[PDB]
Each structure stands twice: as C-alpha cells, then as structure tokens.
C-alpha cells in the first residue's frame, strides 16, 4: 500500500532528524499530502525518534481529524500552507538549533532572513521571510503563514524556529537541512569578512 510506505517514510525521516540533532524532544512535527488529498501528520506529544507509523494522524483538508492519534496543535498552520500553495505537498517544522538561534536576533530582515553566501538556499527556497512572534498555538501564526504561502516555501518564525515546505517530504526535509546548515554557517563565520554572493551571482540562480 502506498499510504503504508508514506507512513514509514515519515517515521524514517523523523527518526533521522532526531538522531542527527535536528529535533529536540517533543518539539516539532511533520506532515505530508496523501494522494487522495488528506494529510499525514505526526501526532501531539510524540517523540520524533520513536514514532509509530500506524498511529500517525490523518487529517482532511478542512481540518477534520480522521484517524490515528491526536494531531499536533501545529497542524493548524500546516493546513494554512496547503490551502494557499497548491505545490506544497509536505511541511517540516523543527526547532533546530541554529535556525531557532537566528530567529531570536534583533534587526532581522522580515523579507529574507539570510543574506546568501552559498548558492543552495537561493536555488531551492529563495526568500525566507520572518513570521512574527506569537504565543505557540496563536491564530495569527497560521494567518500570517497563509499570506506568505503562495510565493515562499520556507519561513522563519521569530523566537520559534523554521517552517519549510516542499513538493515531497524528502524535498522539504532536504530544504530544511540546507536552511539550518546556512544559519549554522552564519554564526560560524561571525564577524569574519565573508565573500557574499554578488547581485549578479544571485540572479543566475533564480532561474
């Protein structure tokens, strides 16, 4: 069954994030779009490193909890991204160290939080806009993500972490990994004179 292999892929990818330090405790959740249009999401209060595939949540496009354990409360803004971007087929939301660290900085650019010095995040994602800080579970987190969903596939929630989309769970996972990697390079480079990509070198990647 295709749904069974999708549940195992989510379990497998979730465990990978947990063992490699991307996921911290019960902080985070993943979701993908099944062929029929329904959602497959990690349940609430679930450690990403030991997920039960047959207990993964199943939510309809309108938000109706269909089967599996209770979905995570963060699924509310997962649905906002699917409803405003037809090319979004999977959402990866983690509180990875360096992306969450970047999101806690004053004077960030809410249109694109990283200035590119490597070509990969511009090629895969482009602009990473900043979502304002709200209490976890706030209505305005999902409402803001719905405004930016049509023309962005990655987002940085302030004092929270990144939220990355993709046309497949593997793609959204890889995109999340390159975003967290780029934020990690920002802090590593620090005050050193970085050779940023010039405006012309950026335009060659937007194609």
């Amino acid at each position: 069954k295709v749904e069974q292999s999708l549940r195992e892929e989510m379990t497998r990818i979730a465990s990978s994030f947990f063992q490699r330090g991307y996921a911290t405790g019960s902080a985070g959740n993943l979701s993908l779009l099944l062929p029929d249009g329904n959602l497959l999401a990690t349940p609430t209060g679930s450690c990403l490193g030991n997920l039960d595939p047959q207990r993964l949540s199943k939510v309809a496009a309108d938000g109706e909890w269909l089967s599996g354990d209770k979905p995570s409360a963060a699924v509310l803004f997962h649905l906002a991204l699917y409803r405003n971007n037809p090319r979004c087929k999977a959402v990866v939301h983690l509180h990875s160290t360096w992306s969450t660290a970047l999101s806690c900085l004053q004077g960030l650019d809410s249109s694109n939080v990283i200035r590119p010095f490597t070509p990969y995040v511009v090629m895969r994602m482009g602009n990473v806009p900043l979502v304002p800080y709200y209490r976890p579970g706030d209505k305005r987190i999902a409402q803001d993500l719905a405004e930016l969903a049509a023309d962005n596939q990655a987002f940085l929630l302030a004092n929270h972490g990144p939220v990355v989309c993709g046309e497949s769970l593997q793609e959204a996972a890889n995109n999340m990994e390159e975003l967290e990697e780029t934020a990690k390079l920002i802090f590593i480079l620090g005050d050193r004179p970085i050779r940023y990509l010039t405006a012309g070198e950026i335009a060659e990647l937007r194609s």
Copy 2:
C-alpha cells in the same frame, strides 16, 4: 509486564542520550517511579549507552537498595526530589555540554539561570534555580534540592550540570532536552543583540 517495559524504556532513553552526545562516559544517571512507588534507577559505574535492563537498580522510597546492581551515588538526591514533590515521577541527571558550561559562569541568577528568549522552557519548566557547588556526593546537594523540589522541576547544579524532573521519564527527558537546547542557544547567540521575550509575553506562557 509493566516493569519490564519501564526497564526497556529507561535503557532505550539512556542509549538515545548517549548516542546524541547528551551523556559523556559514566557521567550521569536516570530514575523513574514504578507503579508500586519504588524507584528504577541506572546503576553506578554504568555506561548509559549499553545498559542491561534486568540489572537496573531498584530502590524503595526510604532508600533501601532492593534488587539490581548497586545504584548510583546520585540516587541520594533523586529520593530527595520524590519526597518533596508528589508530581515528580522521573529524574534525569546528565552533564550535558552546554548546561554544564552555563553552570560554570560567575554572576548567575540562582532563582532562574536563563533569561527566556524562546517560550518553551518557561512553558514546560518555568524557573531553573541554581544549586551551589559541593563535592560530588555531598549531603548538602540533596538537602538543597529538597528545599526547591516543591515548586521547581528543573535545577542547575553549579560546576556540575542540570537535574530535570518530570511526571514521566519521557517528559523529564524532553524537558532536559529543551533546557540543554536553551543553554546551547545562549552561548551561540553570545554578545549579539537578542530579542528577549518581554514580561508580557512571559506571563502568557505561565498559564
């Protein structure tokens, strides 16, 4: 048997801490409360990455070593936390890098060692008070933890590391992971202008 699954869960969670770098050598110990009220703790001189479930220590509420290998000497303050907080059902004590690093700083706040810039540690734990430095195994470590046990679920022992409680071993592990994560962000952010959560944003999380 429920006790068998609790022993395996402790072995499993311990190995996770070891493979992901939270536990260093034989430095650390875990304990949980069994349904009958007795304790299940990791034994002394035991590497958390290769625990034998059927050799885990079993200690009564009064401190009597019942079965299994010799319990860790740190179990003495584990019992202090259970005797002064009825909601404490598991204790996780590790010398994780960034929490232990934070505990070695001068001018720390002994009422709450971290100023929140992310909402999660305030939501799950609240205040992380500082326990003074003593020789490992000192009577005063357990005596101090008994004073703060009633109204705190996490503690930072100076020049030592963190000690986190929970209503379940999974909860105490997740809480430990978010505390160590927050101390890791402190050193990563460094002297950068951090956007701390304002007093009003903190009060919305204490509910």
Copy 3:
C-alpha cells in the same frame, strides 16, 4: 562479486557521512573507479543516508551513462579528476559545515587554504588549492579541477565546499574527514595564539 562489494562500500560510507553530519540533505556525491576503469557514482536527487546499491550510477571514462539511475551533475568534474590524475581512484564531494564555511572567507590563499598547525593534512593531502566560485554545474569548475588534478588530491571550491580524491574510497573518505576536521579547528581556535608548525616541521612531513 567485487562490484557488489564496491557498491555496498559506497552505500555504507555514504550513510556514515550522513549520520555523522558530514552530508546535508541531497547536497553531495561520491564516486569510485571500478577495476575495469568505469565509474561507480551516487545518482542525482539521492539522499546519501538511504542509497540503493543496485541503483548506483555507472559511467564510462568518456562520460557515457551506462547503467543505474541518472548520475549527479557533479560527476562532470569527477571525470575531470580521473582524466588528469592516474592515481585518483575515488572522489568524495560533500558540503560539510566547516570546510564550506572556510570556503566563504575573503582573502583566502588559492594555493593552500589552510596554514598547518596539525601534521595530518600535510602528510595525507599537502596543498589544498582554492577553486573559484561558479554557478553549480558550470563548465569552468571541471576545467579548473582538471588543471590542478595532477599535483593535488584535495580542493576547496569557494562558496561551495571541499572536493577530495584518494587512491581508494576509504582513503578519500578519511582524507575528507581530516580536511573538514582541520577547518573545524581553524574556527574553534579563532583569534587565539596558535602554535603553527614551523617551516622545518612541515618539511619533515612532505617526505
């Protein structure tokens, strides 16, 4: 079959890089030389942590895709290294954090990007020249690597990462690991007074 064990070794080594944080997402590719002279390379759009051995790409010396999935676009400069260094039997290309970080610095030395303070990179690789930044997939990346292939076994592509060769896949992997380790020490040491190896201590290692 020898080819089967070479496919498994590539799968095994690739997974090791992925689980230990050297490989990030789909960023990277490995290749080795089979006894008959043909290439065995990781395919495009493939996560290094879950490679299928029987789907690894097979490319002839002239660049003809023979079997397996579509090879990575980076294979183009893999072939440039084999065609200009008969002792190169395997190529490891990853975007590891600290090597990629070093490659983003202004004022680097394009003849040797690291000044030795440990003896190991000088013993195994020697000089690590800098390849200019181009758009990923540019013809000039392979053309430049062909110029430096005869007398170098490691290369640092600016705003990109390292590219390391070896007389075996294990050797090229070990060389990559010591290069990334040395770049990691550079940023860790920072502005501290480092005791660099003197010119005489370097000459004793070039033998």
Copy 4:
C-alpha cells in the same frame, strides 16, 4: 572465550567513538591488556567504525607482533605506558576535536593543560601533562610518555591530541570522554568570567 569478548568490546567501543565524532577517519588507535599480559590493539590503516574483531592485532609485552593485522605505529608508545605503569590496563588515543584544538595553543602548561572548573577530570585523571610536538612515529614521543607514565593517566600531545590510560578499556574510554568534554567547555566558555574551583575545592577531590 574471554579474549573474544575483549575483542568485541574493543570493536564496540571503537564504533561508539566513531559514530559520536570522537574519531576522525583512520586517525586513532585503541589497545588493552589481555589477562595473559599480551596486548590487543587496533591495526594500522583501520577505520575505527568498522573494525574486524578477529583481525585485531596481538602484541607481546616486548613488542613482538604475534597475530592479527599489522598493529598501528602508535602502539610503540602504548607499550611505553604499560612498561612504566603497572596499573595501566588500556590506552585510548584519538584526535578528538577539542582536545586536539587545545593542544595547538601557545603558552600551555606542560604540567597540567587544563585549569579545573568541573570536578570530574581532577577526580578521575588529575594532572594532564603536555607532551612536546614531534613527527608522528618519533622515538621521543614514546620516550617522553614513559617518563610521565608512572604518575599520570592522561596526556596531551601538542599539535596531535590526547592519550588517556585506564585500569580497563571502559575506564580509559570514559576518562577520554571527560577530558575531551572539559576541553570542549574551555573553548565554549571562552573569555567569559569562569568560576574556577578554588584550591580548597580541588584538594577535596584528590583524595
């Protein structure tokens, strides 16, 4: 057979060091003392993450290679430690990142390279003297380690890394892990005002 379980323990411990980032490539070697007095050491050109237990080297006290693959060239100073400390039963030598980083600093103390701010390295090892930098394989590395072997169980080789002993392989591994952890805290704390252990707090640990 006891020797078989010792070979598996060495293989198991070696893999743990490799997967957790302590060992980098083929850089490093482990050895322990068998009951009969002979040595069990990791062979040369061997990746610590995939050791064959039945191919581990076997060396007599006088240095005669008895069985298994060719022992590592670093075994020469392993034997120097056993011949000058009867309580040394295992030697762990790795080029771990932060210990190797510390060993590259000018103005180190050759009597004890770390000033204690945590009690654990003083309790387990005590003084960590500095061994001068020589070409890898130099006679003077083993000769210097033989001078300090009688009254020290850990050593820091300049521009090289740590070398830790123990009364068992598990003990030497745990000691190595706490030494590398302490060097990691040194760089993390940096220029921050550290609350070092006072002279009186150190004397309570030397007992």
